[PDB]
Design a protein around this ligand. Sequence first.
Ligand SMILES: OC[C@@H](O)[C@@H](O)CO
Lengths: 54, 214, 221, 63
Amino acid sequence: GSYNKDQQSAFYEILNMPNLNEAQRNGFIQSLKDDPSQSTNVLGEAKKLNESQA
Amino acid sequence: DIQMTQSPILLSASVGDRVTITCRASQDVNTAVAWYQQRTNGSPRLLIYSASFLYSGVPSRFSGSRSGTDFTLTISSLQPEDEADYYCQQHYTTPPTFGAGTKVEIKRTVAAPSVFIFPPSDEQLKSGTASVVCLLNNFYPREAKVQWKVDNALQSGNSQESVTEQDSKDSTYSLSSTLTLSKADYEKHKVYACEVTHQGLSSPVTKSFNRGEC
Amino acid sequence: EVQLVESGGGLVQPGGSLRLSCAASGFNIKDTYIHWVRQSPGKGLEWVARIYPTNGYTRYADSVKGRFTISADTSKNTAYLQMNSLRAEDTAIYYCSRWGGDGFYAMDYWGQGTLVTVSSASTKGPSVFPLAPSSKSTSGGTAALGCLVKDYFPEPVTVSWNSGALTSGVHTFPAVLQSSGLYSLSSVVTVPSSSLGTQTYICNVNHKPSNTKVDKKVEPK
Amino acid sequence: SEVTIKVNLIFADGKIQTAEFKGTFEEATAEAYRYAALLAKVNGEYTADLEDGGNHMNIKFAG
Ligand SMILES: OC[C@@H](O)[C@@H](O)CO
């Protein structure tokens, strides 16, 4: 499917996170595709995990 | 009452040209005349008040003058965003009255339209009517001929046109022609064609589709 | 900033009544004249009435005298137009304006206008259909898509794209009255061909008179 | 009936504008000539060439 500029931005953030491994990166991207209503929540958990793996 | 007679009805000029439009009071109104601009579906904008005074924030290319009962509005260097209706109004006596308006159009180089066609949506086709849309995009001049053919039969009486306001930047027009048929009739025929004749095209352009094609 | 905001316009039957309001801000209507001016669809401007709120002096166009009344409440900085015994020819956008503000003997500020429709016809919300981009709506690497907003009454409808984020290349056509007595229009937008399938395109359609709000996603067929 | 008189306005420097005047044939005629006289004050003496039974004019200004 296609995405608005907001969904694109969440994708971009998770794609660029330096401390995620690729299983985690793609898992979070998959969640963004799964449920757009959860974009903010998903991004927040991705950030927490990225920070904890610094 | 006092009537205000505006002239011309329509004036068309190139970007950078000086244009003058006029307004005549049926009797003395001293200098009690204002000019308004109206465009892009917006409210009237005051340009000039008391015949010759420029309202704050209005570009200096606008000016007004009076000679007896004759009032003029002049635009010294016409810009594309000046395409509009212009109205004069007197307040010398009650009722305050308006001129009937002058429309200013921008003259520019000829541009042939991009011609596109849209079959009825599957969503519309669930119920009983079919709308076919022919789109002519970003062309000049406004004059264009759009004819519908269904299985090569010329259609009449079942289409309507709409045209956009002259574009604020590139001074082009766009036009839609919509053919309306019953769903039953749409499903009975195969070839749907929009034929466009325009000065910018070396010969008429037909845009078409077969019902059912991807 | 000086501002005037009209409200109250809507569909009314012939012989019916409507009340418009004109809310002023950024100045006091006690210091100016307030006018109502109307405009029939596709026609010129016509003065309707005026009031000087400081002393309540009023004047009317002959065509509305006795049927319309203008008034003001300086405590609410608002003017009003009561419209009774309405007729088809009263159909128009009604603007309020000020005159004499800051010493300017002209109408220097106007509201956005409110539409009054006098008709026996009933309110009807639009159907919103996709105009899907296809091989038949693309050339030169750009593609046209849109929404058909069909069969509504009365005017107006508004259309935006992607909640106002998409404005370039948009053409929203003037509504046209169909033989059915219902309005229809299309709004189209031209975008890069390469963006189809990756960028979401949604037309946001609002028909306030029927409380119809539709967000229609438009994608390739 | 209401008629439209179409006018080409041809200025000395080769610039061209077009205008339309509407009303009865006699009103529109009078307005077209009035407008020409007005423009002539700034743009030079005019000449008006009539075509199509007077429904079209070519109005040239001397500069
Ligand atoms: O949209 C109104 C603006 O273009 C004018 O005031 C200048 O012509």
